[PDB]
Amino acid sequence: ASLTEIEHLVQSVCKSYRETCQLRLEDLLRQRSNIFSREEVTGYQRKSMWEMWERCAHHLTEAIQYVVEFAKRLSGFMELCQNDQIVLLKAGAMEVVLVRMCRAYNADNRTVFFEGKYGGMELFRALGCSELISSIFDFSHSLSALHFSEDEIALYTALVLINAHRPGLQEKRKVEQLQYNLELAFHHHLCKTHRQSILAKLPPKGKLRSLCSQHVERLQIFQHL
Numbered sequence: 001a002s003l004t005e006i007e008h009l010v011q012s013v014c015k016s017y018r019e020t021c022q023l024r025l026e027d028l029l030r031q032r033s034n035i036f037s038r039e040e041v042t043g044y045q046r047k048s049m050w051e052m053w054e055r056c057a058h059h060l061t062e063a064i065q066y067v068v069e070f071a072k073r074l075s076g077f078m079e080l081c082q083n084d085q086i087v088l089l090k091a092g093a094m095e096v097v098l099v100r101m102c103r104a105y106n107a108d109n110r111t112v113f114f115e116g117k118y119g120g121m122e123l124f125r126a127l128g129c130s131e132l133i134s135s136i137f138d139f140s141h142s143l144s145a146l147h148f149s150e151d152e153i154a155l156y157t158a159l160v161l162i163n164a165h166r167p168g169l170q171e172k173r174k175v176e177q178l179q180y181n182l183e184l185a186f187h188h189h190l191c192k193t194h195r196q197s198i199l200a201k202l203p204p205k206g207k208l209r210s211l212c213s214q215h216v217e218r219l220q221i222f223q224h225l
């Protein structure tokens, strides 16, 4: 009920990202020149699928390991029952990772940050599902064509978690309110930055779900972590 407490929420959510920026954007941009040479690439291609999926599920579990803190520094988040605190992240934290990967994306050369270097999707010929791989590349490519800002990722990823239509919740009405205040806080900073035009350039609500869902099956056929 105050412009201060609304901006305070905006300023808060952006602070949670700055620490849970798993990667340093400065390093990401400064290392965008250091690229897996075709010799160094060819090493990854030999590995059987059972290797990369582990390496992938390792970094992903490590990447999620920074989403878990981020979720907990949000206003009123611990004021939920553990039921309505586990139901959220299991469905939500996965989609947050796919977002933060846009930071690690260089749409100039269509490359992504993998184990200290940048590499294309031929770095993943071993897995055997390039269509899913490419769809992730073009998805992150659909957020480089928006030139996202740090506080735009922090404010959108935060509204990926805070969904009240997640089944299994119990304190539902208690989640809607916290989602209301994040919708308005999101639109507000968009207005006061003249970036509200992207509200339609967004990938839909259903694209994010059908992406990692279509993948996490395959990650679970192998590692299941």
Ligand SMILES: O=S(=O)(c1ccccc1)N(CC(F)(F)F)c1ccc(C(O)(C(F)(F)F)C(F)(F)F)cc1
Pocket: 053, 056, 057, 058, 059, 060, 061, 062, 063, 097, 101, 104, 112, 113, 114, 133, 136, 212, 215, 216, 219
């Ligand atoms: O950003 S990643 O480098 C990545 C590379 C290629 C395709 C997707 C994502 N990495 C996140 C981290 F920074 F931790 F490395 C990541 C790797 C792989 C995944 C996958 O879960 C998979 F398939 F390998 F298991 C997938 F992208 F497919 F979902 C997710 C995130």
